[PDB]
């Protein structure tokens, strides 16, 4: 089992079966093939990853497949990256080739930028020999800066052999994909979908910021399978139409990036009883994710917050004494690229093992790993420590709340008092009387000195680029 290979035997046997969509634009399998191919052969003899530059074009995915078969792997930068961190990129990879699947004219400092068009109407074969092998570098993933991770093409074989596992669906299924492809959450959608002959569909930046057009995309294609940030899954809970009842081509669900509140998922069980949901919990540096649970009905009544599961193949996870979980094994990158400090700081693979230090505070309790916090988000005040994290679950634990992140407020380099920034269950009437009972609610879950001075009531969350909650610009909005 091989990535190119499946890929292949599906094509092989039904060439028109639709392999990408991205709204009215469609990619079959053989065209897929095809110009994976044709690329591949502008692509040869390069020993320099093939900068992959665009958003939801289904060329992205040539793309991808292309410089797979060349062996030189990909860079994926998506277009809501900012410009200078683009020409950062391109400056630290050295292309030789940079792939422009937009519209508009792209170009670089580095390397020969081409169009869809060259391959469009190359003449190239299309039949090419997949010259990768298993310890080169498929990708080159760049970090959210909340540095390129360097992965090995033998941990996304193994990664995707292991979603396919995870996969209760089978084969030919309709896929969504929500992750821009500079996320390796899409990743978890690609590779998987591809692998199993699925159509993989591409929920894009609009989307997300109109969710009448996500509506409208949803009608048109009955998506089986979605993979997706937890926080675009909680915002998709308020189209009301997304229900089992009648929406009921989907039946399975993963999770990654982002703790998966109590409330949604409860919210989603209801709503699905049938379907398969997963959490999953890794960091881009041990290959998408490393760790797995379904969560039922049992999950969700016997766990008051969820885990996230147990570890994969490639994945050996233990707890250092302070708490910080390490993940040893294939899934481990080689490293970030062309930075030796940033490198050394937290990984650590001698003698072929090869070991990642994660910054996240882990717990094994009765066979199953939970996500605590990551380790900077931890506050002393009072003197006492909890994780930032720890305080936004007791909010989320309040029938006032429907969703809510905490802000740290220093001065002299220290933490003062906590701001909560809450999307109320109701939209909040009156000001005095909801901080007040937020409050009061909190008596039972939270140690006052833990309980935020002041709340600020916001209508939505922001979302980062790739559809996690934006704290940076929570913060922006508190601070002044
Ligand atoms: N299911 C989950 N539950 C809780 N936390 C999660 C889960 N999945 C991922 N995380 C968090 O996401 C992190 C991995 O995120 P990712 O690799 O996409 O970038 P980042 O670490 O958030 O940002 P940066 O690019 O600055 O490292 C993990 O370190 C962990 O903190
Ligand atoms: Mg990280």
Same mark, same amino acid.
């Given at each position: ?306 885990? #996230?599961?147990?570890?994969?193949? &490639?994945? $050996?996870?233990?707890? %250092?004494? /302070? ?5 040893? !094994? @294939? ?14 700081? #937290?990984?650590?693979?001698?003698? &072929?093992? $090869?070991?990642?230090? %994660?910054? /996240? ?5 009765? !066979? @199953? ?112």
């Amino acid at each position: 089992t091989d990535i190119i290979n499946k890929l292949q035997a599906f094509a092989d046997a039904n060439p028109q079966s639709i392999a990408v969509r991205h709204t009215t634009d469609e990619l079959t399998y053989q065209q897929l093939m095809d110009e994976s191919s044709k690329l591949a052969h502008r692509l040869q003899g390069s020993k320099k990853p093939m900068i992959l530059f665009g958003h939801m074009s289904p060329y992205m995915i040539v793309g991808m497949i292309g410089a797979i078969k060349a062996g030189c792997g990909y860079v994926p930068v998506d277009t809501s990256i900012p410009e200078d961190r683009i020409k950062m990129i391109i400056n630290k990879v050295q292309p030789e080739f940079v792939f422009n699947t937009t519209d508009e004219s792209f170009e670089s400092l580095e390397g020969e930028v081409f169009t869809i068009e060259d391959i469009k109407t190359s003449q190239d074969p299309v039949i090419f020999d997949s010259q990768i092998k298993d310890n080169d570098t498929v990708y080159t993933i760049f970090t959210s800066g909340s540095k390129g991770v360097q992965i090995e093409y033998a941990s996304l074989v193994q990664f995707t052999e292991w979603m396919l596992e995870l996969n209760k669906s089978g084969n030919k299924q309709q896929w969504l994909n929500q992750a821009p492809f500079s996320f390796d959450l899409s990743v978890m959608a690609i590779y998987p979908c591809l692998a199993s002959g699925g159509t993989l569909n591409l929920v894009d930046k609009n989307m997300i910021n109109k969710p009448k057009l996500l509506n409208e995309m949803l009608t048109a294609t009955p998506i089986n399978i979605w993979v997706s940030t937890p926080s675009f899954m909680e915002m998709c809970l308020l189209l009301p139409t997304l229900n089992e009842e009648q929406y009921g081509s989907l039946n399975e669900f993963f999770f990654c990036g982002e703790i998966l509140p109590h409330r949604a998922a409860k919210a989603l069980v209801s709503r699905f009883p049938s379907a398969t949901i997963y959490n999953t919990y890794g960091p881009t540096e041990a290959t998408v994710a490393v760790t797995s649970i379904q969560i039922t009905q049992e999950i969700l009544d016997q766990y008051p917050t969820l885990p #996230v599961g147990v570890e994969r193949l &490639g994945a $050996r996870l233990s707890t %250092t004494d /302070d708490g910080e979980l390490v993940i040893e !094994g @294939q899934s481990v990158s080689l490293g970030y690229l062309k930075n030796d400090q940033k490198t050394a700081e #937290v990984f650590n693979f001698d003698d &072929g093992i $090869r070991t990642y230090h %994660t910054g /996240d505070k882990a717990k094994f309790e009765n !066979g @199953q790993w939970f996500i605590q916090g990551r380790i900077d988000f931890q506050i002393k005040l009072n003197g006492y420590r909890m994780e930032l994290e720890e305080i936004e679950t007791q909010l989320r634990q309040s029938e006032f709340v429907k969703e809510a992140i905490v802000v740290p407020v220093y001065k002299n380099d220290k933490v003062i008092h906590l701001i909560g920034a809450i999307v109320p269950t109701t939209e909040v009437t009156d000001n005095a009387e909801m901080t007040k009972n937020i409050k009061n609610d909190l008596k039972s879950r939270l140690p006052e000195y833990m309980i935020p001075r002041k709340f600020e009531w916001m209508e939505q969350l922001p979302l980062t680029s790739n559809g996690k909650i934006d704290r940076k610009k929570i913060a922006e909005v508190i601070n002044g």
